[PDB]
Design a protein around this ligand. Sequence first.
Ligand code: HEA
Ligand code: HEA
Ligand SMILES: CCCCCCCCCCCCCCCC(=O)OC[C@H](COP(=O)(O)OCCN)OC(=O)CCCCCCCCCCCCCCC
Ligand code: CUA
Ligand SMILES: [Cu+2]
Ligand SMILES: [Mg+2]
Ligand SMILES: [Zn+2]
Lengths: 133, 534, 47, 102, 121, 269, 59, 236, 55
Amino acid sequence: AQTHALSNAAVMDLQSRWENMPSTEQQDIVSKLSERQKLPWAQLTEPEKQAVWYISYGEWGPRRPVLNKGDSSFIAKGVAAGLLFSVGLFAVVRMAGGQDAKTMNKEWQLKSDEYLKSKNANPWGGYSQVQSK
Amino acid sequence: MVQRWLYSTNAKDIAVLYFMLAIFSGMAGTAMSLIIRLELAAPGSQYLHGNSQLFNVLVVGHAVLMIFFLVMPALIGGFGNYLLPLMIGATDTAFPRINNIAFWVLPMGLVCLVTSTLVESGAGTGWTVYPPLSSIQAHSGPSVDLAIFALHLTSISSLLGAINFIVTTLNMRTNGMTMHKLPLFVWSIFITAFLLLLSLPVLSAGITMLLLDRNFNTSFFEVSGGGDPILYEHLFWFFGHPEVYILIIPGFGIISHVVSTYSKKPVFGEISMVYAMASIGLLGFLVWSHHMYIVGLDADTRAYFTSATMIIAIPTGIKIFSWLATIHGGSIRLATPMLYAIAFLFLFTMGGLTGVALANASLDVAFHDTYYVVGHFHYVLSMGAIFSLFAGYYYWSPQILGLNYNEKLAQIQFWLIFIGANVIFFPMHFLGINGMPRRIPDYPDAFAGWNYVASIGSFIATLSLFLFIYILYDQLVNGLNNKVNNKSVIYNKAPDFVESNTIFNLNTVKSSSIEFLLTSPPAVHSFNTPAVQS
Amino acid sequence: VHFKDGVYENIPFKVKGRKTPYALSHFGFFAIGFAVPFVACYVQLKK
Amino acid sequence: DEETFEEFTARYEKEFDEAYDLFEVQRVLNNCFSYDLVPAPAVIEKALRAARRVNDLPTAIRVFEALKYKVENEDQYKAYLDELKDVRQELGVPLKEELFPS
Amino acid sequence: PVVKTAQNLAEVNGPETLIGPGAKEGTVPTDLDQETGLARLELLGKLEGIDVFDTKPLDSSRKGTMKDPIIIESYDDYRYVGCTGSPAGSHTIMWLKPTVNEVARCWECGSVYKLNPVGVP
Amino acid sequence: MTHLERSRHQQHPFHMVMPSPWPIVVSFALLSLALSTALTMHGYIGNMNMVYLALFVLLTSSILWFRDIVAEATYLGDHTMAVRKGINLGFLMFVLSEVLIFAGLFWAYFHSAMSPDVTLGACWPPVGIEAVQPTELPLLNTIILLSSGATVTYSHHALIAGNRNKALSGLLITFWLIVIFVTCQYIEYTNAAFTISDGVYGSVFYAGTGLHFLHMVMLAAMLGVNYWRMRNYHLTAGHHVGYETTIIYTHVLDVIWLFLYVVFYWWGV
Amino acid sequence: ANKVIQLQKIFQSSTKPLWWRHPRSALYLYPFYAIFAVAVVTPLLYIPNAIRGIKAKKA
Amino acid sequence: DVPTPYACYFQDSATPNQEGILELHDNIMFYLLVILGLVSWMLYTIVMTYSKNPIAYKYIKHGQTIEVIWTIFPAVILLIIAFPSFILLYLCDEVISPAMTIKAIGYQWYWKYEYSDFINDSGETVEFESYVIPDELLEEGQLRLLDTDTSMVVPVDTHIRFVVTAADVIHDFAIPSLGIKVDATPGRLNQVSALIQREGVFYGACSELCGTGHANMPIKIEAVSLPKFLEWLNEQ
Amino acid sequence: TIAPITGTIKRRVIMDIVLGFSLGGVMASYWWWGFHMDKINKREKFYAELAERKK
Ligand code: HEA
Ligand code: HEA
Ligand SMILES: CCCCCCCCCCCCCCCC(=O)OC[C@H](COP(=O)(O)OCCN)OC(=O)CCCCCCCCCCCCCCC
Ligand code: CUA
Ligand SMILES: [Cu+2]
Ligand SMILES: [Mg+2]
Ligand SMILES: [Zn+2]
């Protein structure tokens, strides 16, 4: 089966180099670990247990999540930059476009409020249309 | 490549061609929507120097484009002809030359539609092509003629697609697929093909009647001659509400097929789901009088039709609650198709509640042709078409094309179109609830604030579309690098909780249909051996 | 008739094999789609 | 059709004795935990015995990890843990809580 | 000289022997005479009882363990096979792709399918 | 059979049709027809020549399409049992679509005429209707359509019986008989009693009868090509599909003409 | 005539496209394609005169 | 009466029709907000719980009792919202013994009203059109696209039956303040009763497509008291 | 020894449904008893003052 132990240069701290290792060393280390597996499990060293757990149920390869550890920041900054860029582009085509109506004024709105006040329209709700500056 | 594509017969190439025409015409439809919101942004005709005829032309152009040339040839056309042969394990669809003529008669509809806009005057009538507005007196010039021919060519294409689909799924089920064991999207395409077959003849009849009145001096709807436009209103909405339920049915199918595989549990009661689809399909017919409660229908007629169009909210509610059961008790791997299905669920629920508030004939007297009907239908139609379309694209695109979209770009595309769609079609509920009429290029000088924030929301959604077509280029030229490096999501269904990694590596794809087991981009005529099922 | 399937031959345009860069065509297609209504409004305001 | 807890226990006892390769152990473990109940101490003891007879440690740690994520209260989790004490000390399966110090 | 006309089932060697003779000049063409190609082959199989294009569903009587794999006949190197469980209706329908070189496993009912090929290229 | 031979065939009954140009050619013909008639009916095309050219090229392209599917049916021979059932079901759904077109016209006429402005005096309404004596010109037409259906199923039972000299003569009888019916409808429309602007009743009557005329010339083309395929021995005793779609089309057009006849000349008067 | 058997042997003893095979069809096919080219190239030429407003003369 | 900017409701009611449909609409919106809060809470807690539930419960698919609950709860809530909708719809439809009508015909991009019961010179009824004010003919105080040259005058508190008909093209006589929106086809007329309850100016527009002259088509209804109404009718 | 822990998704689903109904009731009661009641009170106050000016 196997010798007395497995070296901590290969079996300890697998969790930052397993995805970088070549496939030959991957198959070799998992083969030596499965050869260790046949012993009663009170005799395996703790880096071997940590390594075989990182092989089976680790967050590498298939079990990688959808947003790898920094992507909520990227999507928030992207959505914020996109919304501010959309508001900026709409303001640019607002300034470079057609001229506005001659009745979104201040005094015209005030005198239309005077006309609606004299005609007493919208008694309990809001009749005031200033809504512009 | 003319032999592969122009003379084409196989289902996959025709479906890809359907999808490309769908993206092209949907781009044109959203540009028409952009100019609609641009002239609508400020009170007064700012951009279009007057010329309200151009505003009505762009309303009917946007309407006809994004119903008949984006959502129909997308959902029925592309995803239909790609998955309905494949999810049943058929080799290719039966009647394949009919399917090829269906697709290739669509862009002739597109050419005569853009010629209807380009030609002398312009069809200024709206997608409801109501006479006497579409008579020769209120509309000279062949523009209404060419747009009506576009509607006829799209009717021919959707009818041929529906009859091809119903025979292909009624005869070429593979070696175990009894009708109780059909996939859910297949049942949706079957139901909408049945509805298209039982609806589109009446549309072709009514539009031919309008053409006979318009060019051949007949009297069907013109009053000088005894006719009435109430007959066109009856025929066009007897088409039209089955048309929009036809737009919404494969959306339900694609959303169910996303949810039941990203929540890792089967759909709650597939028999109840397909009976709900059959019920909403058959009840889309008998509520066709809800579009003209204003017109002068009697007391018993309106009180029957409001009860029917409010009892149609029972099967849709069965579908929504079954979907919520399907997401409950799963493992919601929040990728982009699941995000699109979640926001489809919420937004379609909000739009359906707006519709059921609209449905009452005692309440339709203050909402018809306001912007409240615009809120309900742009919500339900835009969400349950565009969100379902994006869910289907991000759900099947590595399978049907064999490349990989960037993931973070897909999620920001979803968030941009969600916040844009919400902020554009929530104010139209208020603008309709305080009486802003439909189809106005210039408006009362009080509505400027909401009709300004709506034009902000249109710019947000168009930015989401430009991000989407950047994602398309990135998927098409970096799909292999996205497969290799950690950008995309390679394995769609995650490993389950006690499942190892080597076991998952030997059993990578756990689907409930065939096509996810098919190879990246699949072999040209697969199923050399017929695919057997227990 | 047998069609040579691969990873890029399921779409009717040559993506990698080309003599020009591809993004010009890939955005010119969507830009023609996006610019058809602008040409329509330009013609209608010309008339 | 419906089933009570005892017939469930008998079914997964027979299934956990009949699993042979590593794939069948993890398959019957997944179908043993995907229910509206956490399996019995007898089924978890048979799960550990079938994990030892298959010569694979980490599934016999994911058993306890899935038991923790399946139980509803950590008091009940310790009630399972102190009741499965002899089989865990016998096979020598380190718990995931005491494997990674953080 | 001329290739034959395949009077029976075990005689046809190629598509060229699916021709048949013709009706004389009077009575109508009988189906055995004028039908050609795959229709003629299907007609021969309809005559002698050999149902061509087997629509027989997947045998789901037993489980199909690893030591006794369910062997399925294919004419290509892969065959998409949908399983439901130990009865015909146990679990939700799940598709497996057994190939030539490896078996396919269920993950639900534990079935192991092995593709034996017909092949002979 | 042996496995080596069994691998050398299509392995599944459905038709794997070769690529063909008639989709895009029929589509461009349809585009040219719609664009040309929309230009011509608004005074942009003076001499009506392009509409006739596009109509002819669409007819020739559909004829070439039907020659290709007939050659694939009886010469290449990939028409199995399953494809026979499929093309039968497809034609049945197409006939349902055309029946629905005529039912849409019927419901239009019903909502026009069963609910007009009420009279309040004498009932049995019609005041304003098409002219007198619309009868006996359909009392020859209905009885020749009944005779058409009778001799069509007569020749069909002759064809399954195998006696060719009966079935060809019955086919020639029904072909010449319904084209005599088509010419009789044409001369009835030329020797008419009113025109299309005489109310909604006369307008929908002329529209329905023109669509029925077009479906009858399509039935005449189907009977002509079934006769040309019987004369050159394409039809068999058991594998006939063109005769089955032709007999079901003839019976459906028979019942639609009976419906139009009774509701326009007996009950709706 | 009864040319079904001979036509089956011809239609399966060919390499040409399916609509080209039996030897009467070339005289069918060439004055179809030329007429189709005319009927699809001419109405596209009548669109700029339509959008220019130039109607049909002498009517 | 006049649409408020940044509005979030209906306008101020002036008739039993508008307050009836307002009370009906809020009775509808109560149960619809119940359902929307239900679906939003269910969706939010479902994603925020089961996005991190790694053991997928894939053995739950029958649920017959929850299926009949989903069948029977929309039916009873639809009967609940169908009862007062039917009551108010059969309430507001009958023209319950009026005393005055006025024809409001709609010609192509301008309204024309005929007072159907009052004379002008000698056996001749009174009629006038209501053209929209062109924007170069405005004045500081008057509004764009809702003011007309001839403001239609209606007497307060008598059941008035508006009969509308089109002339050339389908229009829509639409005042949301008086709660009426009634289409006009050139074939047949359409009548609807109302009763204004306060003196006020209520605006409207043709709420149907009308060609290019569709926005600029206002309906200016001024409900004035009956001495002032008779004074305006004599001076008209 | 240990009670068989059965039916956690049943209790969780029924409490989630009753919490959804309680939240919908809170939101809709807020909507009704704020908005509809203030609008009705304002309208009846204005009609009461118009009737008092008429009397
Ligand atoms: C599915 C159809 C659809 C969709 C999505 C939309 C979406 C939009 N529509 Fe509209 N619209 C109609 C169909 C549609 N519309 C119809 C039928 C009418 C009736 C005409 C009438 O009432 O007379 C109408 C009317 C209508 C009005 C009512 C005004 C009036 O009374 O005239 C307005 C105003 O805002 C408008 C503009 C917009 C805008 C700014 C959007 C924005 O949402 C646009 C932004 C959308 C996107 C960014 C979607 C993403 C784009 C894609 C191309 C998807 C790609 C998908 C794949 C590749 C799979 N259209
Ligand atoms: C996308 C297609 C689509 C769908 C699915 C719907 C769905 C519904 N629609 Fe709509 N509608 C349109 C497209 C659609 N509609 C279009 C295009 C127009 C305008 C036509 C034009 O002018 O161009 C229109 C306009 C329209 C009218 C005509 C008004 C008018 O034009 O003036 C009516 C009236 O009945 C209506 C109501 C409804 C109702 C009650 C539903 C129901 O089916 C919705 C049911 C869903 C829910 C109710 C929410 C989900 C259910 C639950 C969460 C269960 C709990 C809820 C309850 C118990 C109520 N909508
Ligand atoms: C003139 C003689 C006859 C033609 C012979 C061709 C001449 C040979 C040399 C040129 C070869 C042409 C190809 C390369 C050059 C070229 O870019 O071409 C232009 C091609 C010609 O396409 P096509 O003609 O194949 O017809 C095809 C008819 N549509 O338009 C294009 O697609 C432009 C490219 C658009 C890119 C869109 C990207 C979005 C795709 C989304 C896919 C979604 C996945 C599916 C999901 C369901
Ligand atoms: Cu009059 Cu719109
Ligand atoms: Cu509808
Ligand atoms: Mg309307
Ligand atoms: Zn299985």
